[model samples]
Target chain A: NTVSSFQVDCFLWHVRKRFADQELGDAPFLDRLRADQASLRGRGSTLGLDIETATRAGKQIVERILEGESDEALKMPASRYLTDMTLEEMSRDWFMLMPKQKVAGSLCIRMDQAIMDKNIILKANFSVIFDRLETLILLRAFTEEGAIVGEISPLPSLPGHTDEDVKNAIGVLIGGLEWNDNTVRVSETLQRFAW
Target chain B: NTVSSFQVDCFLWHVRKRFADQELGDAPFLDRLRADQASLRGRGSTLGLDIETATRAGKQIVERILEGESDEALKMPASRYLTDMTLEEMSRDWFMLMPKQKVAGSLCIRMDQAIMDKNIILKANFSVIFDRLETLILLRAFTEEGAIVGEISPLPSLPGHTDEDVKNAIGVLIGGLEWNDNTVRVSETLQRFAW
Candidate 1:
């Protein structure tokens, strides 16, 4: 599995725009893109995405097609998986719950189901459910590079579990996720408990 | 001396361009400019100088006029005292500076000076500088509201004495030199400063 070049930008723009105006979001993305371009130029390396070029390409696509691919893409299941729905919908839905307890309750119920189904293991050794939840949050808001640099802590071992077991579980789940697949594997796995 | 609206934009643009291109001097002037802009934006309000607007304006002025008014304005001694020399230069000279500190520096200096000089002070107790600075940084890289909410500070004592002294001195000098005649006052002050 491989990450699309625009995936980071798309996710970042979506999250940023949720809280800020479009103009504010564009500024940082442009700055980041220009900085990336300049850095690449300095290094005499041109492998990574160039945001300016990407933006131009995106504009051209829009001009030629008359609409954004993201909007259309989300209409289909295959493309929807690739879309940043966590930013576009889930985060908003979570915030919009009338009562804060309902939101927390829903999360807890979903989390427990995942554990019961073995989609997220809550063994004596580790709480894989917490690890999965954190990863999802990270993916929604952070670039791969950013997550690594931020060095987020893993969920602690349960009362009966050793720290090494907890660390191993977290490492395995993170490493095994196959992030580039872009399929709703986590959701699908967790949803089985609904039946 | 009356502040010229045209000159304000002209000078700010020059320094912004110089900073963009990384051609600014290593003096504190550039640093002050960068810091000022950042500080203004950090305040979480809309209004004050927009770096993007300033940068675009600066580019347009350079292309259309070939020379910025800030440098020429500074050539007059009266202009030096009336306008912050460093800020004026930064507005016009931003394009000339090296990339590292120039862009940031140019923005900071122009924003700082704009609040200090051009921004309206509604009350004697208010520090328009602080308020304007906050808005400037928050709206940095994007143009939003043209100005921020001005407030009167409750604190009777000015935190910094130099600013108060300078304001008082300028007021006294202007009042004593010409109490009723506007033209005579402008001419006398300009001549006194060797404009």
Candidate 2:
């Protein structure tokens, strides 16, 4: 008899292929991805901990890290066990897609800056997209992950165009796929996605 | 403009005729009926109350009246009114169709006694009907008496049945019409005329 092994990377690869349109680029984003892979591997070595547990524990530690821990201090045995990294690092490393992650980071930074800058226009625009994308990403990620995990059956019949398809359709209708192309049209698309 | 005036005897005669099939006795009940007329005329002078108001106020007064004012002071209004002679007069006037009131004094007293006596049996037989009727009557009376009224209509409808037909069905069912031959049938037929 032959023995087989399963890996999360294999699952991630399958998801990446299945949802190829939702990939990331840029050197900084790739660096963050590699760092996340290394952090996941480090967390995997600890007893009674896996990616899920480390992710949760990493969330708490990252909050503390953002308060001020140095990079070297974060990599120390105790801190390494803790995976102390800033929210920026955690968000970037955890989110594989660059455009979406950039939008998210810009949102958080915009929110932080809005209080300082008092820019209502930027804040309002970002706020709308931030709220909408939060739901959209979760729904899309869940659907993708569920299919990969066999929690959802294979798409035997694509019943109708999905939210993403609608979004893409609207993108085409507005004369391009880029977010910053048409503010009014993008706002409408964001509004539709918000629901 | 000519206002139509109905003679008290005529009205009472009509009421009796309306409920002729009910178990109201012959001339003795009629004698009591005439006495009720005289008593109402006497009380009407003091209170100047209409038949409906007088009936209600008479009910309240009957619940509190005593051998003398001081004796009445010792009891609750409802208890003292029950002990009052005027309650007997009111019962004779109102419950002319129910033979049980000849001894029990009034429909209120007889109904109360019947409710108390049949509480366990009737409740066990038709718990839902009993519960709903008691709740509705108490609620309606409470509202009519200018007590605390809950959310009125245009508010959310209550949880269960509101069918006019069903209400009539339940009315007939509980009034022994649906079980005429049954020995333990509980009917509101006698009280229906009073209402």
Worst 10 residues of 2 chain B by lDDT: B79-88
lDDT tens per residue, model 2, A88-113: 21233222222221122111111111
Overall local distance difference test of candidate 1? 0.29
Candidate 2 clashing pairs, residues 3+ apart or interchain? B62-B81, B62-B82, B63-B80, B63-B81, B63-B82, B64-B80, B64-B81, B91-B106
Grade the docking of candidate 2: incorrect
Among all candidates shown, the one with the greatest lDDT: 1
Winner by TM-score = 2
Report how closely model 2 matches the true complex, as a DockQ value: 0.00
Q: Candidate 1's residue-wise lDDT over B1-195, tens digit each?
A: 112333345456456646756755566766766775564455313545554554565556555565555446453222111211112111222221111111221121111211222212111111223212111111111011122212111122333333434333334433322332321112111122221
Q: iRMS for all predictions?
A: 23.7, 35.7
Worst 10 residues of 1 chain B by lDDT: B134-143
Q: Going through the candidates in order, what is chain B's TM-score? A: 0.21, 0.20
Deviation (Å) of A41 in candidate 1: 93
